[PDB]
Amino acid sequence: SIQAEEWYFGKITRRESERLLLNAENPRGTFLVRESETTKGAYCLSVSDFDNAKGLNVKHYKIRKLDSGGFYITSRTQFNSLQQLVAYYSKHADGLCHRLTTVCPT
Numbered sequence: 596s597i598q599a600e601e602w603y604f605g606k607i608t609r610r611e612s613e614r615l616l617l618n619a620e621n622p623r624g625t626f627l628v629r630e631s632e633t634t635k636g637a638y639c640l641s642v643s644d645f646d647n648a649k650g651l652n653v654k655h656y657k658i659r660k661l662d663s664g665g666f667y668i669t670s671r672t673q674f675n676s677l678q679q680l681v682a683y684y685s686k687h688a689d690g691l692c693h694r695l696t697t698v699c700p701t
């Protein structure tokens with residue numbers, strides 16, 4: 596159950612996810628997963644980042660879910676569950692701004 600996951604924030608807005616992530620104490624990779632505001636059945640992985648060019652900022656990655664079962668950001672790399680997707684991206688940065696580190700504070 597994804598709703599049992601502490602990083603699953605469910606139905607919160609894009610602006611709200613940014614308010615939470617734009618916290619000075621958040622190191623790179625702080626994250627949360629929420630429902631998409633516009634695509635039914637899609638989710639969004641919101642991630643905090645930091646660099647000297649942009650400073651603290653947030654990136655949003657759409658996560659697709661196939662009725663055939665897979666969850667993925669890129670169709671080339673799919674997972675059997677949202678939980679497995681989160682675990683993979685906590686170890687590999689791949690095309691993300693940073694690997695996922697810890698759940699966002701509220």
Ligand SMILES: CC(=O)N[C@@H](Cc1ccc(C(F)(F)P(=O)(O)O)cc1)C(=O)N[C@H]1CCCCN(Cc2ccc(-c3ccccc3)cc2)C1=O
Pocket residue numbers: 609630631632633634637638639654655656657668669688689690691
């Ligand atoms: C308005 C906005 O923020 N759009 C996002 C895409 C986006 C659009 C819709 C939503 C949503 F539906 F959930 P919402 O409720 O907010 O409407 C979330 C994310 C975006 O453009 N992000 C960038 C985020 C930074 C990377 C560049 N890129 C393309 C890309 C390139 C590579 C990969 C990738 C990731 C991991 C592994 C391999 C490749 C993913 C996206 C993106 O999509």
